[PDB]
Amino acid sequence: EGREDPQLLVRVRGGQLRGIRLKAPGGPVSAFLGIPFAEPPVGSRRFMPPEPKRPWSGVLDATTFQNVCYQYVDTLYPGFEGTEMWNPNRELSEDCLYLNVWTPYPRPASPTPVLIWIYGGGFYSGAASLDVYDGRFLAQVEGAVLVSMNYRVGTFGFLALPGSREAPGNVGLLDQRLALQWVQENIAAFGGDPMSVTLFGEAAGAASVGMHILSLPSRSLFHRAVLQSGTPNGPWATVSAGEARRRATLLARLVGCPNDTELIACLRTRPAQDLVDHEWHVLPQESIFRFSFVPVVDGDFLSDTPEALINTGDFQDLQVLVGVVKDEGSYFLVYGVPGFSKDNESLISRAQFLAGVRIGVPQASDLAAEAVVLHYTDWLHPEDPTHLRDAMSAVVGDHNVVCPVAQLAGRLAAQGARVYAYIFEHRASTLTWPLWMGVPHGYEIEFIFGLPLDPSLNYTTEERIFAQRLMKYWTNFARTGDPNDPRDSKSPQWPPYTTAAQQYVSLNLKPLEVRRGLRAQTCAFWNRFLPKLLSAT
Amino acid sequence: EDPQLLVRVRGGQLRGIRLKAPGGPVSAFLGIPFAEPPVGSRRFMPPEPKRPWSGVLDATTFQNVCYQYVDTLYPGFEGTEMWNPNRELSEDCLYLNVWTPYPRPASPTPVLIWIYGGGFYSGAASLDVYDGRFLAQVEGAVLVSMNYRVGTFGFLALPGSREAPGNVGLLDQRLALQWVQENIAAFGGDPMSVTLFGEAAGAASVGMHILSLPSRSLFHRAVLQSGTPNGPWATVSAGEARRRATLLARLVGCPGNDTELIACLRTRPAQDLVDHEWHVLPQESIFRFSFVPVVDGDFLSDTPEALINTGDFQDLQVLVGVVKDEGSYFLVYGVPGFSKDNESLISRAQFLAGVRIGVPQASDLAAEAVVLHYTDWLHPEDPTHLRDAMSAVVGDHNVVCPVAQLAGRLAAQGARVYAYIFEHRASTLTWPLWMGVPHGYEIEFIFGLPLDPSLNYTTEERIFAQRLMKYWTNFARTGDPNDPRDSKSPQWPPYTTAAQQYVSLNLKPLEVRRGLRAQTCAFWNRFLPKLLSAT
Ligand SMILES: CC(=O)OCC[N+](C)(C)C
């Protein structure tokens, strides 16, 4: 050193770091990218819990994103931005346990509230390095310290032989928890306040956040929580120990691995790509919005099912912001429901709808699927292909996201939590998906992170202002447990969600509007009636 | 001797009576026998045609009311008593009534035949609300109404027996219908233009005549108000009628072997039979009736469901409808928490318990499905919502969805169907406001009672009754309730399975709506049965 920018040199527990001055529209920010927080989970360490990173000598370069965790790469629409923006943007490697930090430049002189991002992608994909997760805007405009981590996905993250030592399951969640521990020890070196840490995440990232809420060793590592379009409860976020065993064993067979020790040892000899090549061959039914390797109810990380834990938990101390986008299901329809495509209007027949329901509600008996169809049919125009297309989307959206979230918000509020709920209804003007998909899963993230503030991205002026409002809600919540601006009143208030009033807000170009009841009639169908059909048949 | 009031029918001569309607005279012939009294050994038996008589039969007065249960829930209260017998009870009750214009119509006039309701356990053609005076005077209609046997007398069946074969009260109706074919021309009626109409059990009866072949050559058009042959209450199986008859017999000390059991039942005074009429139902219930038409494989060759699903209805015109609050009336007759004397604000607990009684045949799982569907999840515990939903459950299950199913099957199988919902609450109604527009309270408007100034209806209601009398009689004339001279009201379109159009009848002009409680009736008509099947 001696000739470098003295504001980019920072020491952490493992040693010295050098970061990079980045440009944001309104001025510079500090970034520290690819900081290792675990020993590379390679070789004999595959499937194993992470071990904390051993200290390095000299100055670690933290100026570039590190490798993305080994994962399936989407091939449905090759060249198409709508899917490619979610694809890995760095080399795939099992050596991938790194985190990123953005802070004001120069670094804040007083302890600053910290936001920790956890990406989604079904627990089989994702990366903290994608463009839509760029922390520079929140850092620059809000003065926030933003942290994001890679965590293992797919088999590498979630393959489990429950009860074994060598593959106990949930290790991707343990990667996440280790990064939270890293923030506790080190974030003050960056001017971050370890006593004000807010988790946020979308989809599987949101289920992750919820699992940290429900897991006692994680509880002391953060203070507030944001869950966007995902929950730890519901039909996809977890599996039974028995089902996890069954999927691990089948995958083992499919790659030529015929006592748990022997089987796991043989899996550890397999090239990473082989595991990925076979990970979609283990699902019990033809399905969408189901993922092969996900958190498992081990009776350890998750001491009971997420359902049981939200029903009996004490959440007096907790503050949560939860919400959904207007069209949660539409995205998933093109990945497996015959009749659906990005390249046409996807008008479908009644027959194609009944077939779609079986794929979208894969665990449903015949009677249960008939209930779904009868509920979502418009009996005034039962054959209308536009209505049938839109109902198919709502089925998948309600079943996997909207009603799981409605449930969570009710259970948390009944048991002491301060809960704020939203529905995000603005379709980005630069969206490349067709109009029929409305406001698809994942397409609020862009706005929360402040991308429209970059003039080179071609968003409208209104979108720029709208993004600034949302960043303000998110960071006000991180800061105080309350998204409302303390100073400004009469400009509409966001009231807490309660069981008695069921209030939530619309997020769009218009000022906040307060609505009551989150899909209340339909979610009574999913959350109260459908289960009772099962546990009686 | 007024020559207008003197008629020769096939069985001899009759003398009627000049009655006064607000607009002028009408001729009435009340208490005309159409069958041999069904007494002694004829109890439970099909009716026999009335033997000829000498001289002039006096037909100036209503005859006895068929022997039936008399309501005692609210003694002296007009809202219940208006349906109670207004003449003496007697098993000797097979008589009918004819109103015609005065003077007698110069050319053959369309004929309307009224069939009363009363759950198949009660009713009479002599009630004030069934007065044919107004329709005769204003519309020039020939109006006919009969007594038919109710309760055990009309519907106690031991299926396959010769002495108590079931459905005799429907056969009573059929005989009155045959009498109209043979005799109505002498009164100026057109036997080639006969429209049946009826309400509740009367509408179910009209529907049973639609579904029974020997009845079909006896009328040309049909109106079913608030009732259907299909649904949960209008019929029972042979097995279930046998059981109820066998149980009642046991309760009155009779006696194994049909002949013997039926002979012993015939020795029993009428009131002994009625005394135990309400001790044979399988469940604690409301909107259920002990003795009703039976699926005998004869009058009804298969179930009403089977017959409407497979029938050919191409030559048929039908008018069907419901009132806005079909179920409210019934709740005070057995659902804890409900009374006419207060607002009936109930708890959630009272709502779940109320559902088991309103849907008595429902399994635990089906009951929950109903509760979950009718709960408003924004206001799950609000007493006003819970009360109104209880009413709605009972109305939909028993009348609205049964009607929606019938309307749909008829339209699809070639019938011409017009549907309505009746939404005006009579200003003179003695029932409380929370009951809204209850089961049975459209009848007085269609019969035209608001036209009697002594009765204290509003001017609005008089104009409104005139509109309804016109739709009903237009329908009788042509099979289309639209006025063929008026150039738009707007027009009442036919009900079809595609468009599902029906009209609201109230003080405002006709409004066309689409879909008769479509989402909720899918639940009852499509989902609940599938829940029955698999469980
Ligand atoms: C988008 C999505 O959920 O993909 C799952 C199906 N897959 C991985 C085989 C394409």
Ligand SMILES: CC(=O)OCC[N+](C)(C)C
């Ligand atoms: C649907 C899926 O599996 O991945 C898309 C990326 N996501 C969920 C973060 C928007």
Ligand SMILES: CC(=O)OCC[N+](C)(C)C
């Ligand atoms: C009013 C009604 O339909 O109930 C009949 C049975 N009752 C009155 C004997 C209890």
Ligand SMILES: CC(=O)OCC[N+](C)(C)C
């Ligand atoms: C209590 C009962 O079932 O009958 C009421 C009279 N009715 C049905 C003609 C309106």
